[PDB]
Amino acid sequence: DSLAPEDGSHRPAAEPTPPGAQPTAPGSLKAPDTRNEKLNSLEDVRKGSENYALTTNQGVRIADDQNSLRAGSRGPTLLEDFILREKITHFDHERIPERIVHARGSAAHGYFQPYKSLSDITKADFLSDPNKITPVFVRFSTVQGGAGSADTVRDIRGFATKFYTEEGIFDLVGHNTPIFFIQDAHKFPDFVHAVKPEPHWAIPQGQSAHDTFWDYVSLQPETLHNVMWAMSDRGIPRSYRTMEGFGIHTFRLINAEGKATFVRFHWKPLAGKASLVWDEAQKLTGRDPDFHRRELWEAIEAGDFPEYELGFQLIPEEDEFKFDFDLLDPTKLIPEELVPVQRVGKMVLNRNPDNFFAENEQAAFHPGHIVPGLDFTNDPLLQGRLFSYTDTQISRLGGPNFHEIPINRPTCPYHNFQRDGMHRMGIDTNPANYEPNSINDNWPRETPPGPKRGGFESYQERVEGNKVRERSPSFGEYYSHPRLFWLSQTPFEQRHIVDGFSFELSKVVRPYIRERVVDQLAHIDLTLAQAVAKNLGIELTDDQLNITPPPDVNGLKKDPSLSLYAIPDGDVKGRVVAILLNDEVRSADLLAILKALKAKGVHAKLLYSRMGEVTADDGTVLPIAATFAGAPSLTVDAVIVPCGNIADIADNGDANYYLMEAYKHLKPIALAGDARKFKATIKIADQGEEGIVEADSADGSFMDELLTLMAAHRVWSRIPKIDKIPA
Amino acid sequence: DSLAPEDGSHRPAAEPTPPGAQPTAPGSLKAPDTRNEKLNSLEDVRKGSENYALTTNQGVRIADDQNSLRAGSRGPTLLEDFILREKITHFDHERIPERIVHARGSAAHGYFQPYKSLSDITKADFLSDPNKITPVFVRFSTVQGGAGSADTVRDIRGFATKFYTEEGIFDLVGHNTPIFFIQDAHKFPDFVHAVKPEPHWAIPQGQSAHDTFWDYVSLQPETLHNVMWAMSDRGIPRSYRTMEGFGIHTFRLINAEGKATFVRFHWKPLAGKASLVWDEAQKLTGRDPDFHRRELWEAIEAGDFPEYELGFQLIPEEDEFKFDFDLLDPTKLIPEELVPVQRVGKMVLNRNPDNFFAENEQAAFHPGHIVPGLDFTNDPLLQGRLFSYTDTQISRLGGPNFHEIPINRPTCPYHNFQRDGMHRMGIDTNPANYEPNSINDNWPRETPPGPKRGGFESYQERVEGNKVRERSPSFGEYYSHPRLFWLSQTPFEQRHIVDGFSFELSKVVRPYIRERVVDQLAHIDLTLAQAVAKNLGIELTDDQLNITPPPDVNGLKKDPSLSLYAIPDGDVKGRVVAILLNDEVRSADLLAILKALKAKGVHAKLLYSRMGEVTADDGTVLPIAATFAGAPSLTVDAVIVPCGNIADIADNGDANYYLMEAYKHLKPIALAGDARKFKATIKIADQGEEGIVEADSADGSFMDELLTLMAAHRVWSRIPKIDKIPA
Ligand code: HEM
């Protein structure tokens, strides 16, 4: 029709812009100059729209897209209307099955680059030269919930990276904790079914807090280590940018001379580590179920690119048997105090997709997708994974040509004798469809193994044993890793752990399950169990009080890299602040505030009790971003309240509640001049307290005190005051 | 190993029990004696479990289900482990595509029964006798969100009913408002795409508060009427039990003599109409995303069975053109003040399913499944629907034999010449697979139409017109029904409509879209338009202030049946109350309370600061159902606080906050004896106020006040005081 506004405000600028400033858009329209080899090769499937006629899928122009063909304008719809039937038919078949686990996920494009050559330890081409740039596609996700479930639930997180290398696709499919719940792949459907919604009524969504999950845990102690990680704050991250990444299993690195080294993969966040606190996370699933997906997308649009460092834990083959635990057991970690992480390269995420369904929903990752330079090991969880990812993709993606969907295709060449199958795209001209053949002179040909561009050959490991269905005796210890984890947390992190267990077990209906869990906790640590017991109204038996604790792990009694906050690594860039306005804000306060924030790279959200504009005291006009109710304190990292006509909002229930909720969730609060009246709303002493920044006006140290607290992420010293406070 | 507790507390009693007292279970173990003819025919495929051996799907007993087959205890997994591959293969293929629309839903079994014979107006066998019972299967749902989205979002609700009649299956596939958003089926994909998550980032989940939906509404004024319904409290029901249901389309009833009568279908809830308030509903999507599903399962387990009256709006064929609106326009309703609802029968839901996937997820409903005695009309929306439901079940359910999935099978006989297709169950013995045939003497055979047991014949309506793609000019009126709806609401209902519009338009990023929507509202009612506009910081122009309001609907100024609350119809039976405990409860108070609750069928939940138990002053050991934080006020209808050691919970942040939320959300609160100390937390009344029940002790008088308030659902008179409460 020609319906866009003349002034053209229906379309966002194609340049970096702060969260909420402009409408978000497909990646190639927001950042058309952000390119890589993978992005460039997708140009053959991209479709525009501007200046084109509206057509059927066969290319016939459509004259009327508002009506069906009928006999009379009030008559029956005719069967001969092929335009209507095509339109509704495509609509009716839009959906494909979601992923059996990790259905909910958010993705982006980027690139990886090695810091130096690793030709000494591996012959993988993508790690061989500091100038080789490798394009990546990454998907972050939850585990339990469906694709329409919420982002900030309590759960393990997935971290999958598809490396488009020159010698093949390499998929590193990891998680956000260094261990998994079970030892053998044979139990995966059992563990998955226990955590997922119960089979009679399909409840509950996105939660482990129900009878069957805890039943399975109390009968299978191997799950205790990863259960400790999920009940800690590791289970509710602040953002996909601020969590750690792990491969979990021990793999092999193979060099040109044929030597094998054992490796555990690590992803280290450059924005540091941060998480939410339970009541904020749970509330946040209602006020904004898409908070992580939204933050990821907006961070890239604003230029705050997620950056991670790839790291390796390296173990010589001769050291296979030197630890207290088995290296092939995925319920056990390798303490950084024993085997340091070597920082090897970096990944940067700098462009969003164009179409979620086509790039994200259809992407397929699989741990079996490795390259020459790498190899597997006998970890029994990894072993059964190799079977599963190829099999499941046959029904999810509809056939064996899933590698022909544009986001999954390699950028390097691929030729073989495989043919046909549903949805076949490639037209092969090879006269032969088998080898050995003389009709095409045996092409394509096998290629011997070598130091570069050679064929894949498996490491020749020795196997000796009988065919048995049995667990290795070295896999039989379940309590010392959990205890190592428990003793490395800070005191306030231990408290959050206790509260996660108490909360979750309180939702378990059958009381005997709660009691058996508590018993299992008494084998890990007594203080932990006494504390969980008292919140559930349980008494420990005298026998439970004398259980002997498990041993140290190779002499360690703590490892600080297991805590989120022991060794702080905060980075305030990309964090966001809430500024609550009034109808006559002191513009001198506002300019000192906004300029300090921009200097550190922190975003501001200007809030008010209605939408539209507000006029500052010097006549300056401020556009309002959202209302107090529309952008709750759950969404910001800290609150600033500037001087001005404070009586405008001193009596508004939402403005006050905004300060009580943030105060409760331990975020820093700043009050300028008469905005100090608000201290009475949160029971702050006249004297003041750590975490509340207050001054006569918003000037000098005001902003610097505020930004120091933001780098410390939350105000842990206030824990003691929040139990009162009705928020 | 891993067995049940000695006391048998792992299993639920097979008798009606209140919500939360026991673990929920599959319907056939919870109510073995509840039967109907559909439930009994499902006996062929129900599978048990106690006392059987674990096997593969080929029936081979499994010796060890904890491990994979490997070469040695720490060796590689063997390809020949067929037990392992069968187990993982089935898991890898568990998911099927979710429903294109209405993916999130909850179902139950029950039966329908007519009040009188309706053979003067219809030859429909299920309506011909008061003593004839028809088994039904009903599915309630949201529209927009995926299958793992939350229950209490703002959206339209689906109300689908499958009738297993003796002359075929009849599906009455309706909604909870009497009109739809659009007129022609050709625009369905356009409207659904605008409301669903945006295509570049897949945000937002289960919400219409985003740019593409308001864009579409502002350019298609036909949608305004159902947008009014959605922005009112009709968009957020308290329960599937407390909402109305409609077929929307005008349909036809045909009697034995061939006479036709136009009909609109209604469902009237015998528990009455009731809804949440927005703040509550949004927060409840985070505290329990599965609330409507839970509540339905639990009401059926408690014996508070969902019951509805089927009603008909009947209009003679000669009165087709006697209204100011076209009867075939699905964006127009038929005021009950003009054509009353005749009550025809009752439907009762009395049993949950055994397996949610097998019965709820594979069920297929379709508005084209009618039986002799019913017929269609030329409503252009209805007409397009007939193509769609059959088409989409071919991919969702895998082939053309979906009528052979047990939940979908007819209980009457079905025979024809259709053969083959994927997963074909029935083995045909008929030597012929075509007709006419002489080799089987032509059976099965066609049956002529008649009064009972006849073949289907369409009503022979005259069709006169040219083949055009054109909207009837009679459908070109968009503003008088929304005006009629606005003027029939109570004043507090009106405020909530304004608040829903303001809230959603505040989330639209492109400001010109808000302005256009507000412009459209000015054609309906200038008071409504002005209220929304003030909240968005928008000034109406002089031009807009002089828009002539639309005309009346056949002389009506208003119709009270369009409001939820103008004519009170509430029932307290099945509602739930929170009782906040302390460590020394006055047993006398507690017994007066529980007795009265039990007399009216009101359930109770005893809450505390920890789980386990408390002892009342006389020793009546009280088991705690959940904590304050664990079962928030959002999930109950009213709050009671008994006397006792009140200093136990007087300074508990959670217990004070609990009363402030219930107060904000207009729920009745009862305070006894020293519990009156809590009046300071909700800072109000010295002499008391309506909505707050106080007394020295909990007696008969106290309880009757509280029960009279609960029958009115919420305390509307408290609206003007909530704006100042910080909660
Ligand atoms: C170390 C333990 C494991 C980790 C870290 C892990 C990680 C992941 C991640 C991140 C995804 C989502 C990929 C995406 O974004 O599309 C995924 C999917 C999946 N995983 Fe795993 N997983 C583990 C164990 C297993 C096991 C033992 C099995 C089965 C034997 C399994 C079967 C699957 C399947 C079937 C999918 C869906 C794949 C698809 O639909 O493309 N996983 N896993």
Ligand code: HEM
């Ligand atoms: C008055 C308007 C409409 C109403 C009241 C309505 C109602 C419903 C309901 C209640 C369901 C869910 C059934 C279940 O529980 O499985 C549903 C699903 C569906 N609707 Fe409609 N709908 C309407 C308009 C349309 C239109 C115009 C189309 C297409 C032109 C359409 C296509 C579908 C499809 C394809 C499904 C999924 C069916 C399945 O997967 O089994 N609907 N609709």
